[PDB]
Design a protein around this ligand. Structure first.
Ligand SMILES: CC(=O)N[C@@H]1[C@@H](O)[C@H](O)[C@@H](CO)O[C@H]1NC(=S)NCCN([C@H](C(=O)O)C(C)C)S(=O)(=O)c1ccc(-c2ccccc2)cc1
Ligand SMILES: [Ca+2]
Ligand SMILES: [Ca+2]
Ligand SMILES: [Ca+2]
Ligand SMILES: [Zn+2]
Ligand SMILES: [Zn+2]
Length: 157
């Protein structure tokens, strides 16, 4: 399953205290952009009503039967295309979220999760944003690998 529309809405449910709000907004907006730049998908932030993709920062158990696990391990997770909890992207508030390096990078994590929120699975390329392991890469030279692009275009392009 994939989203059956190309106008897809998202909402930040709550903000991490780790970063300035302005920076959270910008990392999340840019991570949608990465995906809208190589597909016919249009992402729109809304500030009221029910969004397709709910962006949540939470720790431990948070109401969806996938409790987080403290610092380290699981950084985040996201549900595939679907109503209700589907698409929603959650970020483990026990991580330390940063604009750049020196904790866990929100932007990079967000691009990956948004990938799952759109229906992507994982990539065997360590250059892929959908690679299953987090590592800091240079955001300045960040670009989707060809594996990411073909995956997402097989879904939406
Ligand atoms: C064969 C197998 O079962 N592998 C499964 C995949 O089938 C499946 O896509 C996924 C389902 O949970 O999990 C694979 N295995 C592992 S180890 N997944 C990583 C666990 N994280 C998940 C995730 O992938 O989003 C999340 C679903 C809990 S994670 O928290 O460790 C995580 C890992 C890497 C990143 C990341 C961040 C930035 C860039 C690249 C990756 C973010 C989160
Ligand atoms: Ca964790
Ligand atoms: Ca949803
Ligand atoms: Ca935190
Ligand atoms: Zn969750
Ligand atoms: Zn993943």
């Amino acid at each position: 399953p994939v989203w059956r529309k190309h106008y897809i809405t998202y909402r930040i449910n709550n903000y991490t205290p780790d970063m300035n709000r302005e920076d959270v907004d910008y990392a999340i907006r840019k991570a949608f952009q990465v995906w809208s730049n190589v597909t016919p998908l249009k992402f729109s932030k809304i500030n009221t009503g029910m969004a397709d993709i709910l962006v949540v920062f939470a720790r431990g158990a948070h109401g969806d039967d996938h409790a987080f696990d403290g610092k380290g391990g699981i950084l985040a997770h996201a549900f595939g295309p679907g109503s209700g909890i589907g698409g929603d992207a959650h970020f483990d508030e026990d991580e330390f979220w940063t604009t750049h390096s020196g904790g866990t990078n929100l932007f990079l994590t967000a691009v990956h999760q948004i990938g799952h929120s759109l229906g992507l699975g994982h990539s065997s390329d360590p250059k892929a944003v959908m690679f299953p392991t987090y590592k800091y890469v240079d955001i300045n030279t960040f670009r989707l690998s060809a594996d990411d692009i073909r995956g997402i275009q097989s879904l939406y392009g």
